Amino acid sequence: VVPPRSKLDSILSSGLEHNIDHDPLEVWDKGVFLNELLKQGIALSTNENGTLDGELVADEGLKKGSYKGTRLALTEIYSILEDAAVSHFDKRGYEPIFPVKRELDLKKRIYQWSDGTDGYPPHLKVDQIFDMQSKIAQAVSFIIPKDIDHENTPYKGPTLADVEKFNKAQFPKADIMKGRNIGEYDDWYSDARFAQQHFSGVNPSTIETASQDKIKEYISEAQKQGLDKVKAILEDGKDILIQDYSYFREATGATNEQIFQNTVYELKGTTPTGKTTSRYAAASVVIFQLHEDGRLHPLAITLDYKGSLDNSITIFNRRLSPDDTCDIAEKEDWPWRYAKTVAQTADWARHEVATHLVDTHMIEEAIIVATNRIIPEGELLYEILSPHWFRTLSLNAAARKLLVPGVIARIAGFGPTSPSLDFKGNNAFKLIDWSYKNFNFQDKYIPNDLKKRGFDIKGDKSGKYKNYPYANDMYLLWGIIRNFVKTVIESQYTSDHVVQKDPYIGGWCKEIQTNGQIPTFPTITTVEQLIDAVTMCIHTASPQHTAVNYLQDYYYSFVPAKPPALCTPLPQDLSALQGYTEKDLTAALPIGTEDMKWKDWLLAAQLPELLSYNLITYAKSLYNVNKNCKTIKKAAADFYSHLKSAGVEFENYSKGQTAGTVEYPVLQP
């Protein structure tokens, strides 16, 4: 044998077999990271007695870093804040960790309404890190060094072809799709793949039938540009759809003559340095047409809709049909690619703010709070709803404290500036307020939502909805959750009067409509209204949130496919836009070593991991504890069977898409 004293010596004495630099950091050792924060003064300061100051320790933030280290640093600090939140909510008893029995009267003292002065819609009033409720938002600009090595980063460029190349090199190799992005497709820019996102990407649920009036406007704007075939297509008017972001102005208080801009101040600790960076945004409008075979096809994009099409800049597609051929390949149609990117920035905002944050997280929270204030724990409604809300309130607070003012409001183009002293005077937050105000609980029950946005998913046998798997899956899933809810709710609620004389349903509806500020929540008096509202809550908690968030990384990670905002002003008119080139597009995306664009790319690629990083386990758990609980038992067995049966159907709607179309695995049990 070689003895162990010889093996030891040969390892210590000989050169190194393995060079650390060839092995990049994948996740921080938690202990080491917490320390480095300390050493850097990225930490809360305190007085002799133990109480907080209000301030951090470090006066300035970090100097140097590397995209990969800063990327993971943001992630870790965020996950720290969430634990901090979780722990804080345990102490207060907003979400206790070890269960606690609490009368309904003590819960009214614990669960209170915030008052709107933090700048948010109504939520749990919150009041160690959440005791001074800003200083945490500080700590994120402190982790983002003032400059980083730009070599071997995903934004360096200088061209799209460069960042495409880099993107693919970072891929590993349904389960898979998680670990790649839309860059995997060489034609990530294609009209087909662009519009497809309005049916099966992260915001599948806001596109709607275009109205006769809008159609008329574009018929008129088409005529002005001497474009006869477009005019005909529109005038004939068969299945014209619209995705309409023009409400950005209405929702921020913007006038039609004002331009969306976010001037970003470089701070040195807290004071500015003089250096600024502007990001720009737009209240775009896309008109599409949906063909018989199923392919949604884009016809027109209005970059920023300023009151009328006369006052705006509309560009029409050279291809009038998925199969049309122009002399200029889609790849080199730069104005149109610019237009498409612009519309993508609009969708980023509407998705992130309204469809994700507002329509799943913040409405749900108003309902969580009201439920705890109004229904005692023993009751059926409580018993059925509460499992879907676990650890939800604490997470919503991290988002409020840090995610919106630190990231969403930093990389948007709404401004007016960043950072911002008051969040009431900040456009992102007004946009959140408006989304909240204009949410309609009932209109968003799946069957009403499709019918209203104008889709006969339910009955159509033509196959023109085969490329709308969100719709097809959700019709089916919604009815399966409903059926479950029904079997359970009907075990006690045997006629509409049991609902009408329930001691709690009445004030619950009231609490929500008023303090919760969701007037569109039903005033429940029927069993069918009770079934539907509860189905919407389970819908909102699991599958809607999962549809709207699970492929967030896939769609945003490769920033050129769907950038948060523009890095340059919009063109001054149509003529300018028609002369756009690859450089005009590229300038407007966060690519290169200049204008703090790396910081934008960094945050834009990170947001998914910060927002990301099921119903069978539910059904299975429910069946086991319940072994009228005999009715609750069979309801959960049946529910289990049907979700499985549906899984096969979602994989069919995914396959049944037209050829080449990206998969839709998002609702797999």
Give Dmax (Cα) for the chain: 91
Q: Choose between 105 and 573: whose C-beta lies nearer to a copy of itself.
A: 105
Name which of 599, 616, 615, 618 is nearest 607 in CA terms: 599
Q: What is the C-alpha to C-alpha distance for residues 350 and 252, in angstroms, rounded to an integer?
A: 13
Residue 383 interacting entry, from Fe ion, a copy of itself, none, C-beta within 5 to 8 Å by type: a copy of itself
Q: Which residue is nearest to Fe ion (CB)?
A: 549
Instruction: Give the span between the Cα atoms of 27 and 19, in whole angstroms.
Output: 18
Per CB under 8 A, 132 contacts a copy of itself: no
Q: Residue 498 class from Cβ within 10 Å (0-12 exposed, 13-18 middle, 19+ buried)?
A: middle
- Omega before 419 within 30 of 0, i.e. cis: yes
Interacting span for a copy of itself (CB under 8 A) from 272-280, 345-353, 523-531, 616-624: 616-624
Asked whether the beta carbons of 380 and 341 are under 8 A apart, the reply is no
617 binds, among a copy of itself, Fe ion, none (CB under 5 to 8 A by kind): a copy of itself
Sole binder of a copy of itself in the list 225, 462, 495, 578 (CB under 8 A): 462
CB-nearer residue toward Fe ion: 241 or 610: 610
- C-alpha 399/C-alpha 357 separation (Å) is 9
Is residue 22 involved in binding a copy of itself (CB under 8 A)? Answer: no
Identify residues 629-648 at the interface with a copy of itself (CB under 8 A): 636-638, 640-642, 644-646
Q: Does 227 bind a copy of itself (CB under 8 A)?
A: no
Distance (Å, whole) CA 620 – CA 669: 12
Residue 614 labelled as part of a binding site: no
Using CA atoms, how far apart are residues 249 and 306, in angstroms rounded to an integer?
8
Q: Is residue 262 a contact partner of residue 322, using CB atoms and an 8 Å limit?
A: no
Binding-site string for a copy of itself from residue 406 to residue 445, where x marks contact by CB under 8 A and - marks none: ----------------------------------------
User: 3-state DSSP call for residue 45?
Assistant: strand
Q: Please report, as a single letter, which amino acid is at residue 87.
A: S
Structure tokens at 530: 């009770």
User: Cβ 476 to a copy of itself, closest distance in Å?
Assistant: 5
Among 162, 187, 266, 383, binds a copy of itself (CB under 8 A): 383
Q: Which does 22 bind (CB under 5 to 8 A by kind): Fe ion, a copy of itself, none?
A: none
The correct pick among 172, 226, 274, 459 for binding a copy of itself (CB under 8 A) is: 459
Q: Name which position in 291, 437, 451, 466 contacts a copy of itself (CB under 8 A).
A: 466
> Counting contacts by CB under 8 A, is residue 387 touching a copy of itself?
yes
Distance CA 420, CA 400 (A): 14
Residues 540-569 that bind Fe ion (CB under 5 A): 549
The stretch among 302-310, 342-350, 458-466, 657-665 that binds a copy of itself (CB under 8 A) is 458-466
* CA-CA-CA-CA dihedral for 102, 105, 110, 114, to nearest 10: 150
Q: Is 301 left (phi over 0), alpha (psi -120 to 50) or beta?
A: beta
Task: Determine if residue 545 is labeled as part of a ligand binding site.
Answer: yes
Q: Are 359 and 202 in contact (CB under 8 A)?
A: no
361 in a labelled binding site: yes
Q: Measured from the CB of residue 632, what is the shortest distance to a copy of itself in angstroms?
A: 11
Tell me how far apart the alpha carbons of residues 111 and 123 are, in angstroms, rounded to a whole number: 10
* Residue whose CB is less far from Fe ion, 476 or 605: 605
Q: Is 247 helix (H, G, I), strand (E, B) or coil?
A: coil
Which C-beta is closer to Fe ion: that of 362 or that of 480? 362
3-state SS assignment for residue 90:
helix
Residues 104, 129, 177, 498: which binds a copy of itself (CB under 8 A)?
Answer: 129
Binds a copy of itself (CB under 8 A): choice among 460, 497, 514, 655: 460
Compare residues 134 and 523 and give the one whose CB is closer to a copy of itself: 134
Closer residue to a copy of itself (CB): 46 or 612: 46
The encoded tokens of residue 280 equal: 């720009």
Contact yes or no for 180/172 (Cβ under 8 A): yes
CA distances from residue 58 to 42, 63, 77, 268 in whole angstroms, order as listed: 6, 12, 16, 11
Least Å from the CB of residue 290 to a copy of itself: 16
Q: How far apart are CA 435 and CA 444, in angstroms?
A: 13
| Residue list 36-55, contact with a copy of itself (CB under 8 A) | 36-39, 41-46, 48-50, 52
| CA triple 286-292-298, angle to 5 deg | 20
Q: Is 66 in the site for a copy of itself (CB under 8 A)?
A: yes
Q: Which stretch binds a copy of itself (CB under 8 A): 103-111, 173-181, 358-366, 601-609?
A: 103-111
Residue type, 571: P
| Beta carbon of residue 283, minimum distance to a copy of itself (angstroms, whole number) | 34
Considering the complex, state which of residue 312 and residue 549 has its C-beta at the smaller distance from Fe ion: 549
Candidates 112, 209, 386, 546; binder of a copy of itself (CB under 8 A) is 386
Residue 509 CA to residue 518 CA, distance in Å, equals 9
CB of 391 to a copy of itself, least distance (A): 8
Q: Determine if 329 is a binding residue for a copy of itself (CB under 8 A).
A: no
Q: Output Rg (C-alpha) for the chain, integer angstroms.
A: 26
* Number of residues binding to a copy of itself, judged by CB under 8 A: 114
> Which CB, 261 or 661, lies closer to a copy of itself?
661
> What residues from 151 to 190 belong to the interface with a copy of itself (CB under 8 A)?
none
How many angstroms separate the CA atoms of 364 and 358, rounded?
9
Smallest gap from residue 321 Cβ to a copy of itself (A): 23
Binding residues for Fe(2+): 356, 361, 545, 549
* List of residues contacting Fe ion (CB under 5 A): 549
